[PDB]
Amino acid sequence: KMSDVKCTSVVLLSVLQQLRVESSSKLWAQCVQLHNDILLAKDTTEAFEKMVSLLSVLLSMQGAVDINKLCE
Protein backbone atom coordinates (compact mmCIF):
# COMPACT_ATOMS: atom_id res chain seq x y z
CA LYS A 1 0.00 0.00 0.00
CA MET A 2 2.90 2.37 0.58
CA SER A 3 4.65 1.19 -2.58
CA ASP A 4 1.54 2.39 -4.41
CA VAL A 5 1.88 5.94 -3.15
CA LYS A 6 5.64 5.97 -3.72
CA CYS A 7 5.30 5.03 -7.39
CA THR A 8 2.43 7.49 -7.72
CA SER A 9 4.59 10.28 -6.33
CA VAL A 10 7.26 9.40 -8.88
CA VAL A 11 4.72 9.74 -11.69
CA LEU A 12 3.42 13.00 -10.24
CA LEU A 13 6.81 14.66 -10.00
CA SER A 14 7.60 13.56 -13.54
CA VAL A 15 4.38 15.16 -14.82
CA LEU A 16 5.07 18.37 -12.90
CA GLN A 17 8.54 18.52 -14.41
CA GLN A 18 7.15 18.00 -17.90
CA LEU A 19 4.89 21.02 -17.33
CA ARG A 20 7.96 23.29 -17.03
CA VAL A 21 7.60 23.73 -13.26
CA GLU A 22 11.36 23.89 -12.70
CA SER A 23 11.37 27.36 -14.24
CA SER A 24 10.60 28.78 -10.78
CA SER A 25 13.19 27.74 -8.23
CA LYS A 26 10.91 28.09 -5.21
CA LEU A 27 8.24 25.77 -6.56
CA TRP A 28 10.74 23.23 -7.84
CA ALA A 29 12.52 23.15 -4.49
CA GLN A 30 9.23 22.59 -2.67
CA CYS A 31 8.14 19.75 -4.96
CA VAL A 32 11.57 18.11 -4.98
CA GLN A 33 11.66 18.05 -1.20
CA LEU A 34 8.12 16.69 -0.88
CA HIS A 35 8.98 13.93 -3.35
CA ASN A 36 12.22 12.84 -1.70
CA ASP A 37 10.51 12.92 1.68
CA ILE A 38 7.68 10.71 0.45
CA LEU A 39 10.14 8.17 -0.94
CA LEU A 40 11.85 7.89 2.47
CA ALA A 41 8.62 7.65 4.47
CA LYS A 42 8.03 4.68 6.75
CA ASP A 43 4.36 4.93 7.74
CA THR A 44 1.60 5.35 5.22
CA THR A 45 -0.19 8.22 6.98
CA GLU A 46 2.47 10.91 6.56
CA ALA A 47 2.95 9.97 2.91
CA PHE A 48 -0.66 10.80 2.11
CA GLU A 49 -0.39 14.23 3.73
CA LYS A 50 2.65 15.10 1.69
CA MET A 51 0.99 13.63 -1.40
CA VAL A 52 -2.00 15.93 -1.08
CA SER A 53 0.40 18.83 -0.61
CA LEU A 54 2.32 17.76 -3.73
CA LEU A 55 -0.78 17.25 -5.88
CA SER A 56 -2.04 20.70 -4.92
CA VAL A 57 0.81 22.06 -7.05
CA LEU A 58 -0.65 20.42 -10.15
CA LEU A 59 -4.21 21.37 -9.23
CA SER A 60 -3.09 25.00 -8.94
CA MET A 61 -2.07 25.88 -12.50
CA GLN A 62 -4.46 25.30 -15.39
CA GLY A 63 -2.27 23.49 -17.91
CA ALA A 64 -3.69 19.97 -17.55
CA VAL A 65 -7.33 19.77 -18.67
CA ASP A 66 -8.70 17.99 -15.62
CA ILE A 67 -12.31 17.59 -16.74
CA ASN A 68 -11.16 15.63 -19.78
CA LYS A 69 -8.75 13.23 -18.07
CA LEU A 70 -11.55 12.63 -15.53
CA CYS A 71 -13.79 10.83 -18.01
CA GLU A 72 -13.36 7.92 -15.55
Binding site: D4, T8, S56, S60, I67, K69
Partner: protein, 141 residues
Amino acid sequence: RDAAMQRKLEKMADQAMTQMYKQARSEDKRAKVTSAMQTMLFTMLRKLDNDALNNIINNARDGCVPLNIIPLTTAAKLMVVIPDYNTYKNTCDGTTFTYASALWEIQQVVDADSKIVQLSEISMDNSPNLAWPLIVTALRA
Protein backbone atom coordinates in the same frame (compact mmCIF):
# COMPACT_ATOMS: atom_id res chain seq x y z
CA ARG B 1 24.57 -23.60 -53.34
CA ASP B 2 20.95 -22.64 -54.06
CA ALA B 3 19.82 -23.71 -50.60
CA ALA B 4 22.58 -21.54 -49.15
CA MET B 5 21.31 -18.46 -50.98
CA GLN B 6 17.85 -18.51 -49.42
CA ARG B 7 19.34 -19.31 -46.02
CA LYS B 8 21.01 -15.89 -46.21
CA LEU B 9 18.11 -14.01 -47.76
CA GLU B 10 15.95 -15.60 -45.04
CA LYS B 11 18.34 -14.02 -42.53
CA MET B 12 18.49 -10.54 -44.00
CA ALA B 13 14.68 -10.59 -43.95
CA ASP B 14 14.72 -11.20 -40.19
CA GLN B 15 17.34 -8.67 -39.39
CA ALA B 16 15.40 -6.07 -41.32
CA MET B 17 12.02 -6.97 -39.82
CA THR B 18 13.26 -7.06 -36.22
CA GLN B 19 14.89 -3.67 -36.75
CA MET B 20 12.13 -1.78 -38.53
CA TYR B 21 9.68 -2.90 -35.85
CA LYS B 22 11.62 -1.43 -32.96
CA GLN B 23 12.55 1.64 -34.98
CA ALA B 24 8.82 2.28 -35.37
CA ARG B 25 7.85 1.68 -31.74
CA SER B 26 10.93 3.25 -30.13
CA GLU B 27 9.92 6.41 -31.97
CA ASP B 28 6.17 6.34 -31.37
CA LYS B 29 6.87 5.89 -27.65
CA ARG B 30 8.85 9.14 -27.47
CA ALA B 31 6.21 11.09 -29.44
CA LYS B 32 3.48 10.60 -26.82
CA VAL B 33 4.95 11.19 -23.36
CA THR B 34 3.08 14.30 -22.26
CA SER B 35 -0.23 12.52 -22.82
CA ALA B 36 0.48 9.00 -21.62
CA MET B 37 2.11 10.19 -18.41
CA GLN B 38 -1.04 12.09 -17.46
CA THR B 39 -3.41 9.21 -18.13
CA MET B 40 -1.12 6.91 -16.17
CA LEU B 41 -1.05 9.44 -13.33
CA PHE B 42 -4.80 9.69 -13.04
CA THR B 43 -5.31 5.94 -13.41
CA MET B 44 -2.99 5.37 -10.45
CA LEU B 45 -4.64 8.18 -8.49
CA ARG B 46 -8.13 6.79 -8.99
CA LYS B 47 -6.88 3.34 -8.01
CA LEU B 48 -5.21 4.71 -4.87
CA ASP B 49 -8.61 5.57 -3.35
CA ASN B 50 -8.05 8.20 -0.67
CA ASP B 51 -10.86 10.59 0.19
CA ALA B 52 -8.38 13.36 0.94
CA LEU B 53 -7.32 13.29 -2.72
CA ASN B 54 -10.71 12.50 -4.23
CA ASN B 55 -12.15 15.56 -2.51
CA ILE B 56 -9.67 18.02 -3.98
CA ILE B 57 -9.80 16.30 -7.37
CA ASN B 58 -13.59 16.54 -7.61
CA ASN B 59 -13.60 19.99 -6.27
CA ALA B 60 -10.99 20.84 -8.86
CA ARG B 61 -13.13 19.59 -11.61
CA ASP B 62 -15.79 22.16 -10.88
CA GLY B 63 -13.46 25.14 -10.94
CA CYS B 64 -12.60 25.29 -7.25
CA VAL B 65 -8.80 25.14 -7.29
CA PRO B 66 -6.39 26.26 -4.66
CA LEU B 67 -4.01 29.23 -5.13
CA ASN B 68 -1.02 27.81 -3.24
CA ILE B 69 0.38 24.60 -1.79
CA ILE B 70 -2.01 23.10 0.75
CA PRO B 71 -0.13 23.57 4.04
CA LEU B 72 0.09 21.03 6.84
CA THR B 73 0.96 23.10 9.92
CA THR B 74 -1.84 23.52 12.42
CA ALA B 75 -1.59 27.23 11.54
CA ALA B 76 -0.64 28.47 8.06
CA LYS B 77 -3.01 29.93 5.48
CA LEU B 78 -4.89 28.49 2.52
CA MET B 79 -6.42 30.61 -0.25
CA VAL B 80 -8.89 28.78 -2.47
CA VAL B 81 -11.08 30.04 -5.30
CA ILE B 82 -14.87 29.64 -5.24
CA PRO B 83 -16.66 30.28 -8.54
CA ASP B 84 -20.39 29.89 -7.86
CA TYR B 85 -22.85 29.81 -4.99
CA ASN B 86 -23.88 26.15 -5.26
CA THR B 87 -20.19 25.54 -4.59
CA TYR B 88 -20.22 27.90 -1.61
CA LYS B 89 -23.07 26.04 0.07
CA ASN B 90 -21.55 22.55 0.07
CA THR B 91 -18.30 23.67 1.73
CA CYS B 92 -18.64 26.83 3.85
CA ASP B 93 -21.12 26.26 6.70
CA GLY B 94 -20.83 29.43 8.73
CA THR B 95 -17.10 30.01 9.20
CA THR B 96 -15.65 26.51 8.72
CA PHE B 97 -14.27 25.44 5.34
CA THR B 98 -14.21 21.74 4.43
CA TYR B 99 -11.32 21.15 2.03
CA ALA B 100 -8.81 18.32 1.65
CA SER B 101 -10.82 16.43 4.28
CA ALA B 102 -10.15 18.89 7.10
CA LEU B 103 -11.73 21.94 8.74
CA TRP B 104 -10.45 25.45 8.07
CA GLU B 105 -11.78 28.54 9.83
CA ILE B 106 -12.72 31.18 7.25
CA GLN B 107 -11.25 34.61 7.84
CA GLN B 108 -11.52 36.89 4.80
CA VAL B 109 -13.64 36.49 1.68
CA VAL B 110 -12.84 38.86 -1.18
CA ASP B 111 -14.50 38.91 -4.59
CA ALA B 112 -12.94 39.71 -7.97
CA ASP B 113 -13.34 43.40 -7.08
CA SER B 114 -10.21 42.79 -4.94
CA LYS B 115 -12.26 44.41 -2.17
CA ILE B 116 -13.58 42.73 0.94
CA VAL B 117 -16.97 41.03 1.06
CA GLN B 118 -18.77 40.51 4.34
CA LEU B 119 -19.54 36.87 5.05
CA SER B 120 -23.10 37.75 6.07
CA GLU B 121 -23.61 39.36 2.64
CA ILE B 122 -23.26 36.05 0.76
CA SER B 123 -26.59 34.26 0.34
CA MET B 124 -29.04 33.05 -2.30
CA ASP B 125 -30.87 36.32 -2.97
CA ASN B 126 -28.10 38.93 -3.06
CA SER B 127 -25.67 36.63 -4.90
CA PRO B 128 -26.26 38.00 -8.46
CA ASN B 129 -24.35 41.15 -7.53
CA LEU B 130 -20.93 40.00 -6.42
CA ALA B 131 -18.09 39.72 -8.90
CA TRP B 132 -18.11 36.00 -8.24
CA PRO B 133 -14.94 34.05 -8.41
CA LEU B 134 -13.90 34.80 -4.84
CA ILE B 135 -10.89 33.98 -2.91
CA VAL B 136 -11.51 32.52 0.53
CA THR B 137 -8.63 32.59 3.01
CA ALA B 138 -8.50 30.28 6.00
CA LEU B 139 -6.32 28.56 8.59
CA ARG B 140 -6.22 24.91 9.56
CA ALA B 141 -7.83 23.60 12.74
